[PDB]
Design a binder for this molecule. Structure first.
Ligand code: A1BVA
Length: 422
């Protein structure tokens, strides 16, 4: 057999994109708790109304904003960030996360490469730093002000193929590359995760990742598509392991995603302080981003025996993950830990340099087609052409193929194994 797994078309995604699923819940159950950020709690209705005031004031200030318009957002992770992103999506536009800690020259490159039409900051950022001529800047605090006449849904038409966000790399070499992600790819990642994490209206999901990382998107919004609650854990909280663990206990958190080094810090703390309260409501811990090892996973399972663990793998360019490896405490967990099974609506291949699939068990490049393959890198046609190419394989979407630059191999059962960088 050849190293091919095909799941294009496997999962129906429903009629509604992410912002509209949130709107559905706000209409059906307005008083459910939607989002908590430290001392601030919003019901679905409060969050929706505030996002609508922002959206309507944005359309007043920028009447030409809409489909594929890119808006920079330089607001720290918070209720304010969630509200601003939701507002941008409601008016048909897409956003670029620009963490306030990033220096001005990085902001400039991100806005310039993206052709951004405007920048939204919060009051603290506006007071610390000047606007730049030619880049309209508007302030969250003004956009969100009370006005009961501005609280209805904008009801702008959104298509699945429209951009939802552009996420720039944050390495130490070259100009940053801004991956273009579309609403339908973002939705597909969320739909797969909601199923594999067994989510429901009682789910309580942590938003702990930096806004410079694409995983912060599904973390912020997945619960809002299900009637559950997002808990935003900012940098001050995440930097205090003891404090984050206590918060997860008090909040009865059910879903947490981390990288392996942070997982290690959590495991070490709980092993060193067995008297302390633990995240006993967690149903799933997801680890992603770098290679995880079996011994660390088994140490986690000893501490959180009621949880399952997902090893999640994929590139930002394909809307977050393309494989999930689901593990239960009783499983035979050994090194190397698999990266797992293709998400629905993708096809994954292990190929040689000419994109020819290799026999099962042979190492080659991981490449992917399907609904979540994004558009490329904004303002960079050459770099785009290096990794985004026309698929030579059957396709039911837009014919896109993404070369990950990762080496891997496929087992006979279709499970994928990660073998480093090509
Ligand atoms: C992972 C996504 N949830 C997230 N969107 C993200 O990390 N995107 S990414 O584009 O920034 O990095 C992607 C690059 O990291 C590497 N990698 C990612 N996961 C794993 C993993 N489980 N085991 C080993 N290595 C991994 C790999 O080399 C890969 O290509």
């Amino acid at each position: 057999p050849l190293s091919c797994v095909t799941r294009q078309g496997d999962l129906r995604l429903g009629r509604h994109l992410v912002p509209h699923l949130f709107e559905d819940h706000a209409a059906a159950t307005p008083e459910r708790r939607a989002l908590v950020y430290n001392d601030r709690a919003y019901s679905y209705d409060q969050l929706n109304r505030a996002a609508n005031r922002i959206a309507n004031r944005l359309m007043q200030a920028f009447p030409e904003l809409g489909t594929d318009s890119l808006v920079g957002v330089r607001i720290a992770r918070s209720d304010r960030l969630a509200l601003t992103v939701l507002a941008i999506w409601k008016i048909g536009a897409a956003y670029i996360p620009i963490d306030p800690v990033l220096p001005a020259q990085r902001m400039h490159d991100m806005l310039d490469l993206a052709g951004a039409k405007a920048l939204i900051v919060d009051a603290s950022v506006a007071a610390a730093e000047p606007a730049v001529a030619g880049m309209p800047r508007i302030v969250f605090d003004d956009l969100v002000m009370d006005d009961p006449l501005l609280e209805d849904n904008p009801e702008v038409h959104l298509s699945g193929n429209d951009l939802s966000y552009v996420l720039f790399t944050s390495g130490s070499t070259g100009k940053p590359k801004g991956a273009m992600i579309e609403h339908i790819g973002m939705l597909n990642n969320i739909a797969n995760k909601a199923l594999d994490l067994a989510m429901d209206e009682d789910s309580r999901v942590a938003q702990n990742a930096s806004m410079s990382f694409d995983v912060s998107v599904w973390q912020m919004f997945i619960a809002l598509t299900k009637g559950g609650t997002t808990f935003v854990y900012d940098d001050r909280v995440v930097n205090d392991i003891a404090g984050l663990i206590q918060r997860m206990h008090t909040d009865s958190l059910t879903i947490l995603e981390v990288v392996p080094t942070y997982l290690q810090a959590l495991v070490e703390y709980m092993e060193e302080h067995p008297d302390c309260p633990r995240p006993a409501a967690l149903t799933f811990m997801m680890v992603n981003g770098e290679t995880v090892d079996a011994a660390l996973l088994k140490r986690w399972f000893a501490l959180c025996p009621a949880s399952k663990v997902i090893n999640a793998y994929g590139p930002t360019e394909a809307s977050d993950d393309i494989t999930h490896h689901i593990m239960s405490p009783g499983d035979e967990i050994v090194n190397p830990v698999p990266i797992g099974r293709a998400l629905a609506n993708f096809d994954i291949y292990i190929v040689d340099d000419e994109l020819r699939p290799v026999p099962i068990g042979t190492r080659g490049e991981i490449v992917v087609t399907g609904v979540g393959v994004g558009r490329g890198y904004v303002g960079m046609a050459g770099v785009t052409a290096q990794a985004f190419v026309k698929s030579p394989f059957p396709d039911r979407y837009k014919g896109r193929l993404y070369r990950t630059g990762d080496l891997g191999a496929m087992r006979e059962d279709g499970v994928l194994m990660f073998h480093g960088r090509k």
